[PDB]
Symmetry: D3
Subunit: 49 residues, 6 copies
């Protein structure tokens, strides 16, 4: 599960893009949620600060 590491890298970019200036909180956590099936941008707005 370098697979997990790789997914996590993309997830933080996606979080960055969705959340913008409010920023976000990153925990794996989230990755466990979003690396099995794709999380929508709508779903990602949920992890913004």
């Amino acid at each position: 599960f370098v697979n997990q590491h790789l997914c996590g890298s993309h997830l933080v970019e996606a979080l960055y893009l969705v959340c913008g200036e409010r920023g976000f909180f990153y925990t794996k956590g989230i990755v466990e949620q979003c690396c099995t099936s794709i999380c929508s941008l709508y779903q990602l707005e949920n992890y913004c600060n």
Copy 2:
């Protein structure tokens, strides 16, 4: 500021690489510190949660 937005993208990848499994909190306060001047990996490690 398109420039900070671009820099922020690199900054969140760097934070992800350093913090890894610990995860982290991303805020404007880190962007202002590390996208005005370059932060070492040692410094970013201080923002890992």
Copy 3:
């Protein structure tokens, strides 16, 4: 621009995250808009086909 070439790299990534399977058209003109001032994800969905 040196700036536009790098900015374009980030822009195509944002377009991909936003448009997903719908896909998109990248045209150098999308860059003239979104690399001078920041385009929101909402704005970018407009370039999804």
Copy 4:
């Protein structure tokens, strides 16, 4: 269905690099071609505008 999404993220960067000033067209479909099997940079030029 994350492996494909992760791959698609890299493919658009490759397209960006190969096509340059020409721009390119991105489609589900191009990803199934180039994320099932590795496409050479030569192959990718086919997707440039």
Copy 5:
């Protein structure tokens, strides 16, 4: 194969960040190593110039 190819992309970004101005070296021998099991920042320092 595509996964290894993709993983290598993340590996060189990690090496760039870890090595900084020293620069770095990699081979498809090192990519195989750090993409089968995850390499620490410490292990990655081994590939700096």
Copy 6:
């Protein structure tokens, strides 16, 4: 210089896409060449192992 640092990140991505499995030696001289002026795909192949 933060812009040199950021450009360098994109350059390694490009070098990797071009060199793939062959690998490369990444040094200051290459960032000075390809981050002051844009390097073509042919120019990048010059740095592959």
